Amino acid sequence: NLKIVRMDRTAGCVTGGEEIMLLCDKVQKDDIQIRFYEEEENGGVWEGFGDFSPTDVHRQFAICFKTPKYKDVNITKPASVFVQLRRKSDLETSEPKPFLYYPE
Amino acid sequence: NLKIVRMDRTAGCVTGGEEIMLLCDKVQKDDIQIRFYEEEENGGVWEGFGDFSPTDVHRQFAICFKTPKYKDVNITKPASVFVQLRRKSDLETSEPKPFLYYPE
């Protein structure tokens, strides 16, 4: 039942720390994370997490957060990743949205 | 009971048409407008309205909209206005938030 309905930004700088506003279907403020991930060719999986507190969850239907730092702040072209909602308790996830990290 | 909790942008170009995401306390999608206004020195009051449809209201707790065109697209410095929620039915309003229009 997790869904990213809309994000006001779907790209960001590799240094992270940028404010994004996200509209979601209902979530519980203490049982929700925003996971950015990238599947590596070596079977590895990079992940980073949106930076926010339960108070940043707006009436269970939106979240304000800051982006995580991407794995490599020295990329020279954009890196495409995904972002999903994930419940902390049972690790249920939303369908992913594409997200582009760009060089500083 | 109307409240603008957060806006992801509190400035915009005088030409209008720019996407803003707004978090609000509960509203009814068919009984809500976003009014930008400016009190003139001559007792006049400019107003413009955010451009959106009821489907742009997200589960009664957020609204995505486009800014209205400011009264004067030829200003040479920023113009400070206010923005409020207003109920269409009984014209109840939220407390206003400052908003800055800037030259193209």
Swiss-Prot record, chains A, B:
Ranges in a coiled coil: none
Subcellular location: Nucleus; Cytoplasm
Residues carrying Phosphoserine: 89
Leader sequence segment: none
Domain of life: Eukaryota
Cross-link named Glycyl lysine isopeptide (Lys-Gly) (interchain with G-Cter in SUMO2), sites: 77
Function per UniProt: Constitutes the active form, which associates with RELA/p65 to form the NF-kappa-B p65-p50 complex to form a transcription factor. Together with RELA/p65, binds to the kappa-B consensus sequence 5'-GGRNNYYCC-3', located in the enhancer region of genes involved in immune response and acute phase reactions.
Protein name: Nuclear factor NF-kappa-B p50 subunit
Highest classification ranks of the organism: Eukaryota, Metazoa, Chordata, Craniata, Vertebrata
